[PDB]
Design a protein around this ligand. Sequence first.
Ligand SMILES: Nc1ncnc2c1ncn2[C@@H]1O[C@H](COP(=O)(O)OP(=O)(O)OP(=O)(O)O)[C@@H](O)[C@H]1O
Ligand SMILES: Nc1ncnc2c1ncn2[C@@H]1O[C@H](COP(=O)(O)OP(=O)(O)O)[C@@H](O)[C@H]1O
Ligand SMILES: [Mg+2]
Ligand SMILES: [Mg+2]
Lengths: 229, 296
Amino acid sequence: CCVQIMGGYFTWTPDGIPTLSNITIRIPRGQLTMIVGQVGCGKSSLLLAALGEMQKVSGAVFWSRGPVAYASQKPWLLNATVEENIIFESPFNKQRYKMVIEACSLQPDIDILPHGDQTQIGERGINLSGGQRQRISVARALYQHANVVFLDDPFSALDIHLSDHLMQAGILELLRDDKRTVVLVTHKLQYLPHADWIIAMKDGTIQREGTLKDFQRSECQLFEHWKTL
Amino acid sequence: YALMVSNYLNWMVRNLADMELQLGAVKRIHGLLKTEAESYEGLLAPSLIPKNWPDQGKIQIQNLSVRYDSSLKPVLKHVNALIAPGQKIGICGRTGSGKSSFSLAFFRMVDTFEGHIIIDGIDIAKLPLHTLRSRLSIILQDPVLFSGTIRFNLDPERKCSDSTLWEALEIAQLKLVVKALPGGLDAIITEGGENFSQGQRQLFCLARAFVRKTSIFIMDEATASIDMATENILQKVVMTAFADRTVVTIAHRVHTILSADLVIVLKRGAILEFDKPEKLLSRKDSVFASFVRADK
Ligand SMILES: Nc1ncnc2c1ncn2[C@@H]1O[C@H](COP(=O)(O)OP(=O)(O)OP(=O)(O)O)[C@@H](O)[C@H]1O
Ligand SMILES: Nc1ncnc2c1ncn2[C@@H]1O[C@H](COP(=O)(O)OP(=O)(O)O)[C@@H](O)[C@H]1O
Ligand SMILES: [Mg+2]
Ligand SMILES: [Mg+2]
């Protein structure tokens, strides 16, 4: 019932080809959904478009906008304290703070920092591995407390240890929140039985949606998802 | 002349101040002109080195003990490995084990205080670093691009053929995409790659490495950004097209390492029972068994 599109048409530049054409979207509130597809297929573009970013050629986009939490497809950061960019101008909550951190399991990496939590990081601050970068980006939306939370490829950098720990702890905490709708995308399909709603697209066009019954109708797509098993 | 002074004396002072600023800036640049020794010249003869030198690509490391700077603790130590032509061997593990470090152990990116590596016939301690990295290759974990065109993005020089360019695009599964692009591998990659996706840019980097006919090189979990379908197709195509080549594979996806000849597992600062994949998975005793079972 929440944010959705009827016959969406989207494009980066109005002079070129329309990026998205006839896309129809639906995410239920308080639901964990995933969007998968090919590389370059058009999965982040639809999302940025849903964030008012992409020039829509046509389509209608209904909301509830909200201060939607966000983590870009590549990690970004501010030139300020670990605590600073993690807080992102929010009422500091020791409980929520350490909860988010232990969700991202960043504590060992915070101990190794010269000033730990109050370590100035960034293009001005000190450099660090893109793994920490990704975990911090995720923490940005986690501690964000936002109703509609959003993630883009939070798993690319992390290995399976941190991916499992993060998704379990943090995502299970999000779904543990009352109605904190959280939307993401992934490159691995193992948590697809852990998704509630699913969006499948390829080459800039949606293909399918629906958790269990709507999947089983595909032998092809589901054998593809079964290539890894 | 008193009027003259009353006029120009104040300009004299103000220009003294402004030039003081400017010369402080010049001194800043100059204090930066002081630079550290990079040691490009290696203590080995280029005449002793043949042209197509890294022919076999057999690699034997032993007690290889590295560290980024002298102050930091050793990040990888007491490691030994004889690597045959071994068309495809694998290295994997959890984060921080130093696998990217060991990847950079070849190109002497790291201080390697103890131990040594032998590329067929010779150590690493004597090559010219330019010659060193000129005849090898690597695929960085992160994709980094160049503002320009596919000609310039792949070929800094021009000493290549469009045939081979399209070949590298194809074997990386890019040519199919590029066909849709109006440039003809002549479009413009803008500001490090803000036109294409993460995985797109990673693919470009893979292909760029692939431009080199080198038969020995390495990859740093290049497939992390890549989805599963292209992962399978790409790893297959590269194994086939590089059936002769000797590639060392970092894999953030063990499902990709299940195919290599040898599997190399790093726990903290060394290997734990590097072996063929079948033996390690059927023994179950290695932690790579758990790595492949948590995925399934
Ligand atoms: N900033 C941009 N400007 C113009 N075109 C873009 C931009 N980003 C991506 N594109 C194009 O739009 C298409 C869709 O890309 P999208 O943003 O969905 O990346 P993605 O597929 O989500 O990322 P990944 O490939 O890692 O899943 C791609 O083919 C790409 O060439
Ligand atoms: N530029 C650097 N400076 C100091 N230490 C580094 C640097 N890069 C990596 N390290 C250290 O090396 C270890 C492993 O590095 P790396 O191989 O890049 O990561 P991984 O093992 O996950 O591939 C980490 O524990 C990290 O602390
Ligand atoms: Mg994207
Ligand atoms: Mg690494």
